[PDB]
Paper text:
Landmark proteins called autophagy receptors bind specific targets and interact with Atg8-family proteins on the isolation membrane through the Atg8-family-interacting motif (AIM) (also called the LC3-interacting region, LIR). The core of the AIM is composed of four amino-acid residues [W/F/Y]-X-X-[L/I/V]28. The first aromatic residue and the fourth aliphatic residue bind to two hydrophobic pockets in Atg8 (the W- and L-sites, respectively), and the main chain of the motif forms an intermolecular parallel β-sheet with a β-strand (β2) of Atg828. Nonetheless, deletion of the short helix from RTN3245–264 reduced the interactions with mAtg8s. Thus, the C-terminal helix-assisted AIM/LIR is a unique structural basis commonly seen in the interactions of yeast Atg40 and these mammalian ER-phagy receptors with Atg8-family proteins.
We also determined the crystal structures of GABARAP (a mammalian Atg8 homologue) bound to AIM (LIR)-containing sequences from the mammalian ER-phagy receptors FAM134B, SEC62, and RTN3 (FAM134B450–468, SEC62361–376, and RTN3245–264). Remarkably, all the AIM-containing regions of the three ER-phagy receptors are structurally similar to that of Atg40, consisting of the core AIM and its C-terminal short helix. The core AIM residues of SEC62 (F363 and I366) and RTN3 (F248 and I251) interacted with GABARAP in a similar manner. In addition, as with Atg40, the second AIM residues (E456 of FAM134B, E364 of SEC62, and E249 of RTN3) and acidic residues in the short helices (E462 of FAM134B and E370 of SEC62) interacted with R67 of GABARAP. In ITC analyses, FAM134B444–470 and SEC62355–376 bound to GABARAP-subfamily proteins (GABARAP, GAPARAP-L1, and GABARAPL2) with Kd ranging from 0.11 to 0.30 μM and from 0.19 to 0.57 μM, and to LC3-subfamily proteins (another subfamily of mAtg8s, LC3A, LC3B, and LC3C) with Kd ranging from 0.21 to 1.11 μM and from 0.92 to 5.18 μM, respectively, suggesting that these AIMs interact with mAtg8s with low specificity. These interactions were significantly weakened by mutations at E456 and E462 in FAM134B444–470 and E364 and E370 in SEC62355–376, as well as at the core AIM residues in these peptides, or deletion of the C-terminal helices (Δhelix). In addition, the interactions were also impaired by alanine substitution for R67 in GABARAP and R70 in LC3B.
Numbering used by the authors:
A (entry chain B), B (entry chain A): 1 to 134
């Protein structure tokens, strides 16, 4: 409601410790929100995901950071598809982080997007060789 | 199924960074699980909550750690009632952390317990004067 009070709640301060994103640094919020809003409108069966390396990760690079992922793929299948894009062995460690936390491997990409997408309509994922974002 | 393979999942490694608890260090898991199962059976309308101070918190002490909380109380109301037990002013900073994260102030204690109780059936909350757990 335009004339209703907006509650400011302590948990918003979690954003003080959000994961680093060069993507966010290079692109202003309004352009990001524009593109993610347009792409969610255009591929509603898919979610847009920015996949970036964690600051101290010792792990092979990824060419593209922007992915349109079917919303019914699990996180585990996404591990496989990113691993295949990085060209990692099955044994090479690969960890995802959403809001600094390893997401459930059973979870769907659509459920992660619904719960953790940002106000620019993008889901941000960091990847590392280690199990702690750092 | 006992004869079925148990999935070992990457997100379990989140527990490597679990918040400190003097309670868990002083009481072995099996005694805690016994008490949390018995107390969940006796009080189905309530959730058992362990409230302990964060390692770096500069904040008044709590005489008791063990609380039986009605599961329909909000996080905001639980803030108020813990505030009343510490005897803090309204304007004195007080933050809760569940699994290192500030919970939603609108969430119910029962929901928080459902998503975040540990295998001893206790919900663990740390409190601090600062907005980041440390």
């Amino acid at each position: 409601g335009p004339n209703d009070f907006e509650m400011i709640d302590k948990e918003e301060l979690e954003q003080q410790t959000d994961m680093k994103s060069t993507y966010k640094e290079e692109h202003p919020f309004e352009k990001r929100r524009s593109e993610g809003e347009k792409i969610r409108k255009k591929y509603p069966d898919r979610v847009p995901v920015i996949v970036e390396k964690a600051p101290k990760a010792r792990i092979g690079d990824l060419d593209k950071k922007k992915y349109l992922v079917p919303s019914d793929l699990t996180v585990g299948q996404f591990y496989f598809l990113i691993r295949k894009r990085i060209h990692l062995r099955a044994e090479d460690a690969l960890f995802f982080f959403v809001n600094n936390v390893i997401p459930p491997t059973s979870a769907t990409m659509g459920q992660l997007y619904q719960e953790h997408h940002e106000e620019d309509f993008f889901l941000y994922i960091a990847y590392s060789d280690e199990s702690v974002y750092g």
